[PDB]
Amino acid sequence: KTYIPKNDEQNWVVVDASGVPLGRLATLIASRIRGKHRPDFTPNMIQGDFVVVINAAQVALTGKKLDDKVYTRYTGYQGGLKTETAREALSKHPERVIEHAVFGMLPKGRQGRAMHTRLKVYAGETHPHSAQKPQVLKTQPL
Amino acid sequence: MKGILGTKIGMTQIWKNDRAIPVTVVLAGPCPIVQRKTAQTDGYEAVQIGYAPKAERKVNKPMQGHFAKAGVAPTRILREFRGFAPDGDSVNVDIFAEGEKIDATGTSKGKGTQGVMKRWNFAGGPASHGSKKWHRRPGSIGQRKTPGRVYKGKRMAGHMGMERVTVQNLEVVEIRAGENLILVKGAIPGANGGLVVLRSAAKAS
Amino acid sequence: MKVRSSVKKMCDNCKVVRRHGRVLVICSNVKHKQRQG
Amino acid sequence: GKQPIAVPSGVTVNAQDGVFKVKGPKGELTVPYNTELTVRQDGDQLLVERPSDAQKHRALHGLTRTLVANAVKGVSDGYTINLELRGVGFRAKLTGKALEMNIGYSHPVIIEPPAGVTFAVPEPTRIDVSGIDKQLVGQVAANVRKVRKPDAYHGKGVRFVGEQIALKAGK
Amino acid sequence: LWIQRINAGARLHGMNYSTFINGLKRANIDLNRKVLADIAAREPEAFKALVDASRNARQ
Amino acid sequence: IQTGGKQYRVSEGDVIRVESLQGEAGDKVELKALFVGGEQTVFGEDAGKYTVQAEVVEHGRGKKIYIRKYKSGVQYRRRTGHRQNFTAIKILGI
RNA sequence: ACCGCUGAAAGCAUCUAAGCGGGAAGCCAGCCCCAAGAUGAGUUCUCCCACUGUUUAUCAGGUAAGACUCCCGGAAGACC
RNA sequence: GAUGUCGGCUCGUCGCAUCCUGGGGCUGAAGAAGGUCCCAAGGGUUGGGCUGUUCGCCCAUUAAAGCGGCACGCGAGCUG
RNA sequence: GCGAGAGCUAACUUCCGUAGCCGAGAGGGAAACAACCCAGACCAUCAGCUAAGGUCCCUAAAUGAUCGCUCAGUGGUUAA
Ligand SMILES: [Mg+2]
Ligand SMILES: [Mg+2]
Ligand SMILES: [Mg+2]
Ligand SMILES: [Mg+2]
Ligand SMILES: [Mg+2]
Numbered sequence: 001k002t003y004i005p006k007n008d009e010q011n012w013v014v015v016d017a018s019g020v021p022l023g024r025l026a027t028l029i030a031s032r033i034r035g036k037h038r039p040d041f042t043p044n045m046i047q048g049d050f051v052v053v054i055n056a057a058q059v060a061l062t063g064k065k066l067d068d069k070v071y072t073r074y075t076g077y078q079g080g081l082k083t084e085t086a087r088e089a090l091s092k093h094p095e096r097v098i099e100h101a102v103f104g105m106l107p108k109g110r111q112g113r114a115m116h117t118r119l120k121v122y123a124g125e126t127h128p129h130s131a132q133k134p135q136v137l138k139t140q141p142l
Numbered sequence: 143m144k145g146i147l148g149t150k151i152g153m154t155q156i157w158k159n160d161r162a163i164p165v166t167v168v169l170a171g172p173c174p175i176v177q178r179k180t181a182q183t184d185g186y187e188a189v190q191i192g193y194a195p196k197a198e199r200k201v202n203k204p205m206q207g208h209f210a211k212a213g214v215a216p217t218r219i220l221r222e223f224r225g226f227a228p229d230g231d232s233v234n235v236d237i238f239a240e241g242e243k244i245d246a247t248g249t250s251k252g253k254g255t256q257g258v259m260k261r262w263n264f265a266g267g268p269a270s271h272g273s274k275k276w277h278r279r280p281g282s283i284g285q286r287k288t289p290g291r292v293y294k295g296k297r298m299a300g301h302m303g304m305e306r307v308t309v310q311n312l313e314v315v316e317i318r319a320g321e322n323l324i325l326v327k328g329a330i331p332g333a334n335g336g337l338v339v340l341r342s343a344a345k346a347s
Numbered sequence: 348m349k350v351r352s353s354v355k356k357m358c359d360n361c362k363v364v365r366r367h368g369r370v371l372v373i374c375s376n377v378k379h380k381q382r383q384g
Numbered sequence: 385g386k387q388p389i390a391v392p393s394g395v396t397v398n399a400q401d402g403v404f405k406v407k408g409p410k411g412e413l414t415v416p417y418n419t420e421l422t423v424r425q426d427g428d429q430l431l432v433e434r435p436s437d438a439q440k441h442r443a444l445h446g447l448t449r450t451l452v453a454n455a456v457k458g459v460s461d462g463y464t465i466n467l468e469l470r471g472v473g474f475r476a477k478l479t480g481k482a483l484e485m486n487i488g489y490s491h492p493v494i495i496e497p498p499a500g501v502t503f504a505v506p507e508p509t510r511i512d513v514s515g516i517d518k519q520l521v522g523q524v525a526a527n528v529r530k531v532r533k534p535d536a537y538h539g540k541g542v543r544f545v546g547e548q549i550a551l552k553a554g555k
Numbered sequence: 556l557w558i559q560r561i562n563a564g565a566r567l568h569g570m571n572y573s574t575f576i577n578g579l580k581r582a583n584i585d586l587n588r589k590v591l592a593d594i595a596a597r598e599p600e601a602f603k604a605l606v607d608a609s610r611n612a613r614q
Numbered sequence: 615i616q617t618g619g620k621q622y623r624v625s626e627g628d629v630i631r632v633e634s635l636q637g638e639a640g641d642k643v644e645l646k647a648l649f650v651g652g653e654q655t656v657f658g659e660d661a662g663k664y665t666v667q668a669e670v671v672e673h674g675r676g677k678k679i680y681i682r683k684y685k686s687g688v689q690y691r692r693r694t695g696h697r698q699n700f701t702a703i704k705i706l707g708i
Numbered sequence: 709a710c711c712g713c714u715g716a717a718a719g720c721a722u723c724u725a726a727g728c729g730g731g732a733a734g735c736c737a738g739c740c741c742c743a744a745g746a747u748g749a750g751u752u753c754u755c756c757c758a759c760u761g762u763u764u765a766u767c768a769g770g771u772a773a774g775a776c777u778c779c780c781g782g783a784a785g786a787c788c
Numbered sequence: 789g790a791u792g793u794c795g796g797c798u799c800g801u802c803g804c805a806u807c808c809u810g811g812g813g814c815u816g817a818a819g820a821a822g823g824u825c826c827c828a829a830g831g832g833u834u835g836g837g838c839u840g841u842u843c844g845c846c847c848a849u850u851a852a853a854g855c856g857g858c859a860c861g862c863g864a865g866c867u868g
Numbered sequence: 869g870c871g872a873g874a875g876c877u878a879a880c881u882u883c884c885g886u887a888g889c890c891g892a893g894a895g896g897g898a899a900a901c902a903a904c905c906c907a908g909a910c911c912a913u914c915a916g917c918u919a920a921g922g923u924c925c926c927u928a929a930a931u932g933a934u935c936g937c938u939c940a941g942u943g944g945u946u947a948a
């Protein structure tokens with residue numbers, strides 16, 4: 001009895017990570033991806049708006065972007081495959097500090113993985129807006 | 143940076159003064175330039191050089207197209223060289239110089255499937271105080287219920303050789319241009335007749 | 348330097364400092380140079 | 385607390401933003417500070433008034449003045465410390481500006497003044513770090529006063545003229 | 556599924572399930588809850604109504 | 615809902631719990647809770663005004679469902695048939 | 709780890725709470741090797757080109773560029 | 789209705805309460821040589837005689853000839 | 869858990885007293901998890917109010933309101 005599904009949609013909103021605390025921006029980006037105000041607001045498949053992210057490079061952390069924030073990644077058979085990098089150390093690839101901090105807040109199974117696709121981050125500003133030819137409702141944080 | 147292409151040819155004795163020095167005669171035939179990759183064309187700087195000649199009746203159409211884009215003459219081998227340049231073609235003349243230390247890199251001879259004694263040294267065991275694990279055969283592979291498995295990488299038997307190898311810092315004893323011949327002290331990788339690539343010392347003393 | 352767990356004055360000089368997260372001791376005399384860490 | 389600001393003539397302040405700009409005879413300087421840290425010229429002299437009072441705030445207070453006060457004595461008269469080369473064959477010469485040590489090392493130590501500081505040498509046994517920014521000068525003669533710290537037995541090396549270094553005394 | 560939608564519309568105006576619901580509640584008058592989501596999914600015209608209806612029984 | 619509808623619509627034959635008044639034609643009246651008779655959105659109480667009239671169409675025996683229960687190791691296996699009765703009612707009300 | 713410049717809260721003192729510098733066989737980069745199934749599968753240069761099949765055989769069928777099959781070998785190799 | 793037991797050999801890998809190399813504070817640190825504590829596991833850490841030994845004793849050297857963990861690591865790997 | 873002995877006021881230790889639950893107990897919560905916490909499953913229902921616990925995102929619900937505390941990531945492994 002409860003309502004079915006659409007498709008003919010795919011809102012292409014555009015947040016901005018400048019100065020905003022990674023976490024809050026995260027939750028938001030994460031939410032509009034899984035299903036913000038939601039269309040049929042249905043599980044089975046994603047209807048969660050595609051999210052473009054600019055700047056990134058200038059997101060924000062608090063007491064640590066040197067201390068604490070240690071992104072870890074343990075390679076092949078752990079024969080000393082223990083790799084850790086400072087979040088400041090993510091002056092190499094800021095696009096990941098987000099990317100891989102939001103995939104976190106998204107479901108973790110089949111669909112979920114299918115979901116990082118819509119998220120699309122860029123550590124720039126203008127130049128980014130180039131890899132952007134559809135709508136772009138810039139729905140900033142709060 | 144700089145560098146050329148060539149065919150290994152053999153080694154032999156040679157006295158420079160009163161010291162007998164072994165060398166590897168390498169034929170670094172002239173090398174045409176068939177494409178200059180630019181940080182603004184292909185996104186990074188580099189040169190496409192070419193080597194052995196190839197009969198035209200053997201050249202794919204697509205390849206001709208390429209080679210013609212620079213009126214070269216089908217080679218059979220093309221390779222790149224980052225941050226390299228000049229005009230015309232590439233021959234050791236002025237490129238390398240007697241005394242220069244260099245880095246020759248070829249493809250190692252191929253040993254096929256080799257056990258651990260010969261692929262990693264290992265040590266196998268006994269030969270008399272009891273066995274069936276005579277000389278070769280590795281020992282144990284792991285430990286037990288903990289890391290109840292084996293490590294990624296544990297050296298084991300496997301195709302040995304047939305790899306890219308680069309022996310660093312080699313003095314160039316003698317250069318006989320106009321024969322595109324070149325004698326490097328020491329020993330370069332792979333079989334005679336094999337391709338070899340010589341270059342500035344990637345990082346020498 | 349002295350890395351003791353129970354750091355405290357030793358003579359009318361010891362200027363118990365508190366640098367980066369650590370409780371320290373700086374006195375004219377060096378054998379007095381203390382430090383919890 | 386601190387307040388008395390002797391801001392004599394030549395100088396020129398500019399609390400334009402967080403950029404507490406400066407200009408004087410020695411040369412135009414610059415010295416940031418907190419914003420909430422209040423300060424501007426009231427009549428003749430100057431003052432850095434503060435919001436709250438106790439720590440967080442009073443610290444920054446006992447901070448800014450002294451800081452600015454330095455920009456003053458700077459453009460006004462400029463800084464210049466004087467070092468002492470001491471002990472046998474210890475000696476400084478010079479290359480353009482670059483101070484040149486020679487204090488018992490198998491080879492010689494070559495120093496080079498940073499953009500906006502100059503070395504000076506009277507007798508090749510006495511050093512002089514003259515400059516503008518109080519800090520740097522300190523923050524550089526420092527590097528000289530390191531190429532060789534005085535020893536606890538004959539206090540050789542570099543030092544501060546009336547440098548008080550007693551000898552532990554050996555055998 | 557119902558509660559999820561009921562407030563992705565609730566918040567579509569400036570409310571949110573939590574609030575919204577207690578409101579219709581504040582108005583014994585209102586008493587759907589069952590089909591409420593659907594009303595919020597298909598009839599936006601309607602759903603708004605109930606939305607504002609609550610704020611107008613709220614503060 | 616929890617028996618006897620409400621809301622808007624256009625008059626369709628829907629199934630609900632048994633209504634007691636057997637036969638057919640049994641003109642049924644349901645209060646109302648919300649609806650839009652002319653896009654006129656009408657909420658509670660202010661809707662009680664309007665109402666719905668539906669007629670009992672037929673009485674039915676749901677689709678046989680089996681109620682099976684189970685706990686392991688303790689033996690315990692339970693098989694039992696089931697199916698809930700209803701009443702068809704053609705909507706038609708104000 | 710340790711040593712320091714400018715410096716308040718404690719009109720002094722202070723490697724410090726603003727700030728700044730030096731500093732290990734260790735960390736990161738660097739060296740050699742693998743590497744886009746990096747399914748987010750990237751880039752560049754060149755070649756072939758726009759065929760045929762009636763609502764009865766709805767799609768595969770001739771083909772280009774190119775390659776495989778097969779033969780004869782190899783400093784390649786268990787087989788591939 | 790079976791989780792093979794001591795030692796060795798082979799293969800390793802990890803912790804650090806570091807044996808040696810690296811950086812430091814204090815020393816009762818003259819220099820040379822040490823002591824001690826702080827930081828630091830990258831890599832390295834010999835060959836023999838006696839004993840099943842593990843250990844330990846000894847020879848001859850070494851920068852050093854570290855201590856522990858992984859079913860007192862490892863018998864569908866060998867020994868026995 | 870509470871009251872005792874035994875035991876190092878050690879043990880998912882042992883022996884008694886006594887209450888509760890598991891055993892013969894599903895459901896929600898405590899990541900996972902017999903017994904802890906809230907609760908005792910006659911069957912059906914795309915209905916409703918609550919318990920314990922919770923209301924940034926992964927999951928349901930205030931990133932709620934007011935006055936404070938700590939900058940430690942304390943929170944999210946102890947003491948003299
Ligand atoms: Mg052997
Ligand atoms: Mg064959
Ligand atoms: Mg030492
Ligand atoms: Mg076994
Ligand atoms: Mg106690």
